A = this chain, B = another copy of it.
Amino acid sequence: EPFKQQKVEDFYDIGEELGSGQFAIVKKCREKSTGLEYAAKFIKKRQSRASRRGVSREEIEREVSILRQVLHHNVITLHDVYENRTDVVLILELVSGGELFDFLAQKESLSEEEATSFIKQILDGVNYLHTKKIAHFDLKPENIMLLDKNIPIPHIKLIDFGLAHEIEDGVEFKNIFGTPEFVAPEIVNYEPLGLEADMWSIGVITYILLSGASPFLGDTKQETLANITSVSYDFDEEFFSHTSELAKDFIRKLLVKETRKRLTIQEALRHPWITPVD
């Protein structure tokens, strides 16, 4: 399943840049044969050794392999993949609804019920993943897009799969990555990583989503990491002076240090605040 070794140019019309992380750059584009819009991700292959620039072949494949296994509506989808000598081009689904968070900004008022809507979608998408035994490992507001903003209740789309890694049984994996703010403890304290991680983030997102304040955001990374490791957050009335205990609860069960004690996706879904039993 190699990558088509042709020039993308040939089958697509590379348009404007829509974003560019670091060793990869995204530009809107078009399928020549269909006049269909797509998003083209250019992942600069690594130079050689300590090559401060470029992505490892594994990290590459690891991302691709993954994107290929996933096929859920609440998750971004990879149409095609081409490969030249400088970069590796991914033809990904195009996401225009912008960052969920931004949209929510314009929205001036959010009901928990309405909020759980989104959160739930996030869950449904994440669920697909985890089932295929996969960890996005990079869940954050900047990575929670919207298909088309133009609908009372938008379709959330998970993107950015560079930090995604396929979890295996009895094969330990630890590493330090991601935004200081959304990472769980097992990461900060270089410990065994599992799907559990992605859950912590869900909580963090929800906390932010409801209150608009980050549970662990400190003045300095130095500071934050401590909060996360020490698991130090509160439910300040200055923000949670309206929130249901049902909400807060959901939060509480996800922001837990002990892996096995923290809720699992399946668990998180059948939680009253999400799926009202009665």
Contact = CB atoms under 8 A, between A and B. Distances in A.
A190 B189 CA distance: 6
Interface in A228-244: 229
Chain A facing B: main interface SS: loop
A221 B229 CA distance: 22
Interface string A97-116: 00000000000000000000
Interface in A175-214: 175-177, 181, 188-190, 214
A175 B59 contact: no
Given A188-B190, A189-B190, A221 B181 contact: no
A40 B256 CA distance: 45
Interface string A217-232: 1011110011001000
A260 interface: no
B59 A176 contact: no
Given A58-B219, A189-B190, A190-B189, A175 B49 contact: no
A222 B190 contact: no
Interface in A151-190: 173-177, 181, 188-190
B219 A175 contact: no
Contact of A220 (B49, B59, B214, B220): B59
Interface of A: 49-50, 56, 58-59, 173-177, 181, 188-190, 214, 217, 219-222, 225-226, 229
7 contacts: A49-B214, A174-B225, A174-B226, A176-B188, A177-B221, A189-B190, A190-B225
